[PDB]
RNA sequence: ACUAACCAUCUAGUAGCUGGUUACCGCCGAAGUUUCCCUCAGGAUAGCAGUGUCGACCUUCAGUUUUAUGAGGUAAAGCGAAUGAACUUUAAAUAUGUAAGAAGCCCUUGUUACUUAACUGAACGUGGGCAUUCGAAUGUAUCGACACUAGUGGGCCAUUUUUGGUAAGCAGAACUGGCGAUGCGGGAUGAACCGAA
RNA sequence: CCUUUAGUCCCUCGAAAUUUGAGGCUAGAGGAGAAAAGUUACCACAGGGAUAACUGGCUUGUGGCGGCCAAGCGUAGCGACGUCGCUUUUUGGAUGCGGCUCUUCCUAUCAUACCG
């Protein structure tokens, strides 16, 4: 067994894109993770596979849910984010 | 040298007894011609093995770091020598201690 | 130096550059040349085996290698036998073409005045 | 499979080699002291300890500032 | 027997033990009857051995 | 909702592993190895042995010596030669590569799409020269090419050369020899010793 | 950009007074690039190669190291017996297969015999 990073294996287009992918051997650019919505949403989602098999169904859809809120804030933060450096 | 300490995993499986461990050796200081019993600060280079370096084998021809303090030795500046090079000589496994002789 | 395809050249193995470094077996070896490059050479070697001779190829630069003279001394001996040939005939009168293992020597007198023999000892003491 | 066919195939050159390269590292160490102690007979011009640093670059240090 | 002694004995012709042969001095075949020397015994016979 | 025992047969199931495998005499007779591919219960090429066909005739050939010339200038003599293993007129011992003919060397001028300032060079051809020692010795139990076929792919010991190491052992490379498939005499006896097949 | 090396005792800053430290100069040495790369007598797992027992005129009562002396070998190096220095001095538990019976042998003898 090797892995598929040591192969040099493409990246195959299905139902989850594959995006802009980067060049190999080049400068892939680092995006950091500071904002305190940003470690929210990387933490809710860990929590969600940590925490992982529920029977109750309105506590599986409220985890949901505040994943699905933790990135609404994140888009609505970056968008903000985005207007202000646009215009000031 | 310490007593109690911990080592790295690296080499914490490693064991050295109390009946193999030295303290101090016979060092001869050639030109004040006297050999005087001096303690063992550090072991520098044994010249067979980077591990035995590592672990403080003493071995023949084996350079370590001993305290001369008490020979007197006057440097250029005016000071007193607390420290020198001194080569192993001996076989201490064969023979129950460690003979140095001093390099000055 | 100029070398072309077809010659016969020795191997010195200087240590001056170790850049195309044979090996002690190569070294002080004699063979013809069979390839040549922008500046090793391929040289055709005759290798020993353990109870037979192969051929081996090896690939030895400009440094190491130069010309041999064995055939020059081979040439030299068919142009001295042709001349000596030719002037034999026009002479009339017969010449050994042919060259002799080296005879024993014949026999001969030596005088022993103002060349007295010296008595030795086994040992010079002195 | 073709490096490890190589590897099985000079296995034992290896060993041999490594034993011999450690023998000559041997060699090189103790002429290196012999030199050390027969500069420090010559002459020298220290101070109270020895260099904190380590022995080979120490050793080095020393005949080269002669 | 080493190989140079073994051909050079083929080709003095000493095939088997006690195979003594006649050969014409020179320098060449002395040389070879000086290396073959531990193998053969050789000298300058007369008139009578001839 | 889901997914034991014995009898006969398929079955003479599947093995690369074990054991065994049937008269005599004669002739010829090994290998334990190079290289390539690939991770096997390994293949391919070459080698040793043999058969057939084709070409010549000791033609030729050769684990050899000699001559010539390399890698070893290694020892030695001298410095009333110069200079100073690193000096040399000279030059050891010792093994070792190559060459020694018609399968030759040249010289001469016709062509070429190559090349050159140019019929100028190189290649392709012509003429000549030696057929009697045709261009060292000794041997020669022939040699070469193609095609095909079988058994082999292990090593142990020792001499010499050499690398390293130990307190001493010892470890590793090259050649050669012995033993494998070898009887016989000798060493009281015997894998490794001596003589000799 | 700092650090080291040798030099003129050539210049600035800081300190102390009857001298220093840090910089400055001459020219050697150290530090395609945020994707990853190099390296280790080290550890863990997995795998490969070599080696596969081993001692067998072996073993016993007198240490090792450095100096001095040292017949010689040699024409610097090897070097015994001693002596000096360290261990080492001016007042008196270790151990982590065992045990018992019988035969015979060894002497490196505890007793008995005889001796100095």
């Given at each position: 067994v090797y892995s598929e990073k040591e192969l040099g294996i493409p990246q195959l287009n299905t139902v989850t894109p594959v995006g802009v992918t980067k060049p190999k051997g080049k400068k892939k650019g680092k995006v950091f993770v500071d904002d305190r919505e940003s470690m929210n949403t990387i933490l809710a989602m860990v929590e969600a596979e940590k925490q992982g098999q529920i029977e109750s169904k309105i506590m599986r859809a409220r985890q949901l849910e505040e994943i699905r809120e933790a990135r609404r804030i994140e888009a609505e933060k970056k968008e903000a984010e985005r207007k202000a450096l646009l215009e000031n | 040298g310490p007593d109690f300490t911990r080592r790295p995993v690296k080499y914490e499986r490693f064991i050295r007894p109390m009946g193999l461990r030295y303290k101090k050796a016979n060092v001869t200081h050639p030109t004040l011609n006297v050999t005087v019993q001096l303690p063992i600060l550090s072991v520098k280079?044994?010249?067979?093995?980077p591990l035995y370096t590592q672990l403080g084998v003493l071995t023949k021809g084996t350079i370590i770091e001993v305290?001369?303090?008490?020979?007197?030795i006057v440097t250029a500046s005016g000071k007193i020598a607390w420290g020198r090079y001194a080569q192993i000589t001996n076989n201490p496994e064969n023979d129950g201690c460690v003979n140095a002789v001093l390099l000055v | 130096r100029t070398y072309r395809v077809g010659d016969i050249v020795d191997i010195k193995v200087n240590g001056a550059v170790q850049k195309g470094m044979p090996h002690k077996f190569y070294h002080g070896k004699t063979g013809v040349v069979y390839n040549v490059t922008k500046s090793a050479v391929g040289v055709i070697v005759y290798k020993r085996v353990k109870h037979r001779y192969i051929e081996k190829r090896i690939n030895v630069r400009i440094e190491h290698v130069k010309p041999s003279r064995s055939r020059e001394d081979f040439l030299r001996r068919v142009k001295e036998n042709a001349e000596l040939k030719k002037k034999a005939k026009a002479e009339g009168v017969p010449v050994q073409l042919k060259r002799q293992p080296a005879m024993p020597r014949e026999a001969h007198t030596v005088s022993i005045a103002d060349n007295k023999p010296v008595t030795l000892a086994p040992v010079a003491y002195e | 499979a073709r490096k490890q066919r190589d590897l099985k195939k000079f296995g034992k050159a290896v060993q041999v080699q490594k034993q011999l390269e450690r023998a000559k590292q041997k060699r090189e160490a103790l002429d290196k002291i012999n030199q050390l102690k027969r500069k420090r007979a010559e002459g020298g011009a220290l101070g109270a300890?020895?260099?904190?640093?380590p022995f080979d670059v120490a050793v080095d240090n020393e005949l080269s500032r002669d | 027997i080493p190989p140079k002694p073994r051909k050079i004995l083929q080709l003095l012709r000493?095939?088997?033990?006690n195979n003594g042969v006649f050969v014409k001095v020179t320098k060449a075949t002395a040389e070879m009857i000086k290396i073959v020397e531990p193998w053969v015994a050789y000298g300058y016979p007369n008139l009578k051995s001839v």
């Open positions: - | 280079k044994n010249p067979s093995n305290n001369v303090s008490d020979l007197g | - | 300890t020895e260099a904190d640093d | 000493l095939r088997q033990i």
